[PDB]
């Protein structure tokens, strides 16, 4: 995260770290949506242009973390993966359309002060809150700058951007399964996701019921925190039928 700040303890208890077993390293962010299911970006797991195609046994999920590099004894919980599910129409060839994946854990994780699921949006909460200017919150352990790395989880709040401005910022084809967020050059304030933040959540706190909802997944961008560029996020609500189908069938 560029131009964010250190998270408070327990600020993002749905935060998940995707951790490579060998070499031991950060692979991506992710989020906890129930005691057995973790949501992330498909490109965290499958991206053939970079020879990336992880299997279940390659990875662990680390839940309840705050420190990036420490083993947080008595706080974090480490889970193995039973199965990965990638959206069947994830477009890794072109523009990362439908950049979403689920991971089922081998055993349920115990909730605690540090470990708790985020809500997924209903249609009405999505319609109400996915508006230009409305801010969400992005969290992760990724790089602090495009060109270094944080001691603890970082957080930044960023406004959703009007779709024509998102489209006009890039040559990549934008779809209804994406939205963009970030400040405009004339707005002064800054901030973005960066390398290592992929797959983590863009959340909003509903003013109606005072619950946190995951509206987006960190998906893609061009550089990090560049003027006139915006971060792109997977539109979770638009892909919720697939999420529900997987959980109903395999949960």
């Amino acid at each position: 995260i560029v131009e964010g700040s250190d998270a408070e303890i327990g600020m993002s208890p749905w935060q998940v770290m995707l951790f490579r077993k060998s070499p031991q390293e950060l692979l991506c962010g992710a989020s906890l949506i129930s005691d057995r299911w973790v949501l992330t970006a498909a490109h965290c797991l499958l991206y053939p242009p970079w020879d990336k195609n992880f299997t279940e046994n390659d990875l662990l999920v680390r839940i309840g973390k705050h420190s990036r590099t420490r083993y947080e004894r008595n706080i974090e919980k480490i889970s193995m993966l039973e199965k990965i599910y990638i959206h069947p129409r994830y477009n890794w060839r072109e523009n990362l359309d439908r950049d979403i994946a689920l991971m089922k854990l081998k055993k349920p994780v115990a909730f605690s002060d540090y470990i708790h699921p985020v809500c997924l949006p209903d249609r009405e909460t999505a319609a109400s809150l996915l508006q230009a200017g409305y801010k969400g919150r992005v969290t992760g352990w990724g790089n602090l700058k495009e060109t270094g790395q944080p001691s603890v989880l970082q957080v930044v709040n960023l406004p959703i951007v009007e779709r024509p401005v998102c489209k006009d910022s890039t040559r990549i084809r934008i779809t209804d399964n994406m939205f963009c967020a970030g400040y405009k050059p004339d707005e002064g304030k800054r901030g973005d996701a960066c390398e290592g933040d992929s797959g983590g959540p863009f959340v909003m706190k509903s003013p109606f019921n005072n619950r946190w909802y995951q509206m987006g997944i960190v998906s893609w961008g061009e550089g990090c925190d560049r003027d006139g560029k915006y971060g792109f996020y997977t539109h979770v609500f638009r892909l919720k039928k697939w999420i529900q189908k997987v959980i109903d069938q395999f949960g």
């Binding site: 951790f19 077993k21 031991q24 390293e25 950060l26 662990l60 680390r62 590099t69 420490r70 083993y71 480490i78 193995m80 790395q149």
Partner: peptide, 11 residues
């Protein structure tokens, strides 16, 4: 740069 995790999670 990461602290070793318990071996039980790598078995």
């Amino acid at each position: 740069d990461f602290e070793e995790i318990p071996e039980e999670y790598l078995q």
